[PDB]
Amino acid sequence: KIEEGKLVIWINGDKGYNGLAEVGKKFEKDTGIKVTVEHPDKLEEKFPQVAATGDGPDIIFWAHDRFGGYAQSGLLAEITPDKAFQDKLYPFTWDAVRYNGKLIAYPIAVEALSLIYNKDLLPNPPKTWEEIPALDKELKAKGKSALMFNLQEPYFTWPLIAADGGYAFKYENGKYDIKDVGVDNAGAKAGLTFLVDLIKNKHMNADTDYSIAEAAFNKGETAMTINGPWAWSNIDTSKVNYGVTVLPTFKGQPSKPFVGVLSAGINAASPNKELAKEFLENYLLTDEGLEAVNKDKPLGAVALKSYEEELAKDPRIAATMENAQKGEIMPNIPQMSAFWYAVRTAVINAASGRQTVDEALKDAQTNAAAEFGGTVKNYETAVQFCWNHYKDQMDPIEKDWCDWAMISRPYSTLRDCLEHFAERFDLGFPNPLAERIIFETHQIHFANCSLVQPTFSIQLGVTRNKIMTAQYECYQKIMQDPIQQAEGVYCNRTWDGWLCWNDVAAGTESMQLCPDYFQDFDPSEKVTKICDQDGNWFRHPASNRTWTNYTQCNV
Amino acid sequence: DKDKDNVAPRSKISPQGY
Ligand SMILES: OC[C@H]1O[C@H](O[C@H]2[C@H](O)[C@@H](O)[C@@H](O)O[C@@H]2CO)[C@H](O)[C@@H](O)[C@@H]1O
């Protein structure tokens, strides 16, 4: 239950929460109502989980893109500002929080990514992405790098991916057709290729995250980064001589950041909706409230016209809005959660070399579409979707079901799909439903094959082929040999994701050599797996998932 | 052997992984 007579507010950890707490202080002075500001990790995910049970904060801040999904889930109160109040904010900021014709949140501020550069290293920053390699080469000669930014969140890579023609959905005539998706298209491929080539050529590192990029920039090690207005405070503290400017072009077209409007929604389960409204309209959305938050971490271009006017001469804000005009306002529709998850997965897979750029985008769009059109809304529907595609691939090739060359790609894609959706729905992998599905293929497709091992009669890459061949062998072996012939309590034979483990007696630590799947695995080091005193494979207590110890493979 | 994936995914080694 949410407690009545106070306000709990959630906001992300990169924003000015200390400044927002000072606004809370003013509210409590006047009204006696205590305002607590929190910044949980993964709050955009945590909000719908706790609010679904009628719990959570009274007020949730995020960019507007997540809010339609929240509204669809019944988690948000419709807000009711009057005409006089609406007039105090820019019409286009209201449009960002308008979903099915209703206002679902209060708009706070317009955010867009810019190119941030170190004037002491690079007084004339590059106008194009194409000149960044040669520039990095020069800088590396001096112990510096050209560019570091957060590669882990697709927000930061989308500007490049969109530049030459990637898009989420197109807003035409007031509507979004969620069947027309621009993730798997030539322009997205060109921009993602360019990003991947930067990594291949060691101009960037696939592991770079927010904290690493911020620290490299703020220490003077990298001449450029990509970030939003919230980041300028820490730069100021570091005393780097920086400029904020237009993002580089790609193939002669602007980088297109996805523009967010920091927004504040009211939990449908709050017993304090009136207090929340008062706080938001009469304390936060005033020149004085917004100043308090902005002084802590810059907001960007605020939605309140009076304060936006006061700050409009900041060249950093001007740069922010020039980038915003080149990009596109994010949709607020429910499909955004799946869109972002898709782009994240594509980028991670392509940047690591796990998939080609073409395969990464193609799979990302396929699995996103499954959610966008409502076919897949949970793991049970996901598994049905993965199986149905697999069946469609296997049915016409029946005479070749025992030929690894014909079935390897369908079988690998089956696992990619089952595992994608497990991660998506916060489940482990392997898991019992996915295992049931894999056993089913062994039963209906592979039962006439003479061998436990896969055998022959585009193909998978080296690593994937090694993993999938081992997987197939493992399931076939379980099918062959269900029985335990010895007396006693035994863990059963099992596939852990990477390796097959024989049945063993309760209270055994089984050992095998590290698999030769990865260039950074030592195939002379050991993998261990514990079969507990009750005959159950050990589960890691941090996750409660059955867990093999690969920690020594990698050292 | 350079045709193998470079880096084992850390997430699969973590307590959340395999
Ligand atoms: O990376 C995907 C992520 O992008 C946006 O999140 C931004 C947010 O808008 C900014 O305020 C800032 O906090 O950085 C975030 C990126 O890490 C979308 O708003 C978000 O829904 C999406 O998952």
Numbering used by the authors:
A (entry chain A): 3 to 374, 1055 to 1139, 2032 to 2129
B (entry chain B): 35 to 52
Copy the relevant paper text.
CGRP, AM, and AM2 binding to their cognate class B receptor, the calcitonin receptor-like receptor (CLR), is dependent on association of CLR with one of three accessory membrane proteins that determine ligand selectivity; receptor activity-modifying proteins (RAMPs) 1, 2, or 3 (Hong et al., 2012; McLatchie et al., 1998). CLR:RAMP1 is a CGRP receptor, CLR:RAMP2 preferentially recognizes AM and is called the AM1 receptor, and CLR:RAMP3 binds both AM and AM2 with high affinities and is called the AM2 receptor. We report crystal structures of CGRP analog-bound CLR:RAMP1 and AM-bound CLR:RAMP2 extracellular domain heterodimers at 2.5 and 1.8 Å resolutions, respectively.
We produced new constructs with a (Gly-Ser-Ala)3 tether designed to decrease flexibility and we identified a single amino acid substitution in the RAMP2 ECD, L106R, which prevented dimerization of the tethered RAMP2-CLR fusion protein by disrupting a putative oligomerization interface identified by examining crystal packing in the ligand-free CLR:RAMP2 ECD structure (Kusano et al., 2012). High-quality crystals of MBP-RAMP2 ECD [L106R]-(GSA)3-CLR ECD grown in the presence of AM(25-52)NH2 were readily obtained. Receptor-bound AM lacks secondary structure other than one α-helical turn. The single helical turn in AM enables K46 to contact the Trp shelf and pack against AM Y52 and AM P43 and A42 contact the patch. AM K38-A42 form a series of main chain-mediated hydrogen bonds with the main chain of CLR loop 3 and the side chains of D94 in loop 3 and T37 on α1. RAMP2 E101 on α2 hydrogen bonds with AM K46 and Y52. More ASA is buried at the interface with AM, but the majority is still from CLR, 90% (781 Å2), whereas RAMP2 contributes only 10% (85 Å2). Superposition of the AM-bound and ligand-free CLR:RAMP2 complexes (Kusano et al., 2012) revealed minor CLR conformational differences involving the N-terminal region of α1 moving toward AM in the AM-bound state presumably due to AM-CLR T37 contacts. CLR loops 3 and 4 do not move as in the CGRPmut-bound structure and there are no significant side-chain conformational differences at the peptide-binding site. Dimerization of the CLR:RAMP2 ECD heterodimer thus occludes the AM-binding site, which suggested that the RAMP2 L106R substitution (at the end of RAMP2 α2) was key to obtaining AM-bound crystals.
